[PDB]
Design a protein around this ligand. Structure first.
Ligand SMILES: *C(=O)[C@H](CC(=O)C=C(C)C)[C@@H]1[C@@H](O)C[C@]2(C)C3=CC[C@@H]4[C@](C)(CC[C@@H](OC(C)=O)[C@@]4(C)C(=O)O)[C@H]3CC[C@@]12C
Lengths: 36, 259
């Protein structure tokens, strides 16, 4: 039923957790109302 | 993927690869949504006009990898499936409507630096983020062009690749294809004048299209790579399965078995 990482989901061990931002992530977010 | 870049290590931890047992071949991509559940497009499993009709004991899943080929020794996990669920209203025949599928792993996977779930979207994260102009990200191993004929450049790429694509607005989608679009599908990718390229391509079907939520800093699976007339054609757009508009079904089948 669970058994479901709906929980700590969407959190990448290696970036967010490790407080880091991948090479192109910025673009994604920069397009959120043209505005970041 | 056409026109995209190498992925980074750890960049896409929810990325499954749907692999075929015998023979060894790559069928599609898929995504990790839980310790036991993987979500893919239906047409990767059941597609009648192609005598592609697989079942548990044919697929083998491989979580956590980067290389298209290399075994990735204490990084990636192979596993195998208990059951498969196709949306029972999938229209393979006319327009691939409702191209979704849930696959249940035989044994739940151990999360890692490389292996982690993506989140399913919710009403208010659907509403805010699925909008014209907003980019999402698509992932896959899978051809570099149109090897529809064998072709002009790279083949299939050595390592997982990424691309960021803006969503398109409905009429533009509605008007780019003769095929009847439905509400369970959105498109994305550039407009011939916008001056960038890039799109999913064969091999990517089933992978996730994700976005990043600026309210909680989390990754979201907004759509699944479903279909397209080709790869990267000026003024054609790619079609993705609307995951949110299908959410109740995803819920129902996971609230079938457990603990
Ligand atoms: C998956 O990798 C791929 C999806 C893909 O390439 C996505 C994008 C590009 C965005 C799948 C393959 O698994 C097979 C696939 C379903 C298709 C097979 C046949 C064609 C399609 C159904 C599209 C319509 C039509 O395309 C034409 C007219 O060129 C086909 C019936 C055909 O070629 O005969 C196609 C959709 C996606 C597809 C490639």
């Amino acid at each position: 039923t669970f058994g479901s990482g709906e929980a700590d989901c969407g959190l990448r061990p290696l970036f967010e957790k490790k407080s880091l931002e991948d090479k192109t992530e910025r673009e994604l977010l920069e397009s959120y109302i043209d505005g970041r | 993927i056409v026109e995209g870049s190498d992925a980074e290590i750890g960049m896409s931890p929810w990325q499954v690869m749907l692999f075929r047992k015998s023979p060894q071949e790559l069928l599609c991509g898929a995504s990790l949504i839980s310790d036991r559940w993987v979500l893919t497009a239906a047409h990767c499993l059941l597609y009648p006009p192609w005598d592609k009709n697989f079942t548990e004991n044919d697929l083998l899943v491989r979580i956590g990898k980067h290389s298209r080929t290399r075994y990735e020794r204490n990084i990636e996990k192979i596993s195998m499936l208990e059951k498969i669920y196709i949306h029972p209203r999938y229209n393979w025949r006319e327009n691939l409507d409702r191209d979704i599928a849930l696959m249940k792993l035989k044994k739940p996977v151990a999360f890692s630096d490389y292996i982690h779930p993506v989140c399913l979207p919710d009403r208010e994260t659907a509403a805010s983020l699925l909008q014209a102009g907003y980019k999402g990200r698509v992932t896959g191993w899978g051809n570099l062009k149109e090897t529809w004929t064998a072709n002009v450049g790279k083949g299939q790429p050595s390592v997982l690749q990424v691309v960021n694509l803006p969503i398109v607005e409905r009429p533009v989608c509605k008007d780019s294809t003769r095929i009847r679009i439905t509400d369970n599908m959105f498109c994305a990718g550039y407009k011939p004048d916008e001056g960038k390229r890039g799109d999913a391509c064969e091999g990517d079907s089933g992978g996730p299209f994700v976005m990043k939520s600026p309210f909680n800093n989390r990754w979201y699976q907004m759509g699944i790579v479903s279909w397209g007339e080709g790869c990267d054609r000026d003024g054609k757009y790619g079609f993705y399965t609307h995951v949110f508009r299908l959410k109740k079904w995803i819920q129902k089948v996971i609230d079938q078995f457990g603990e």
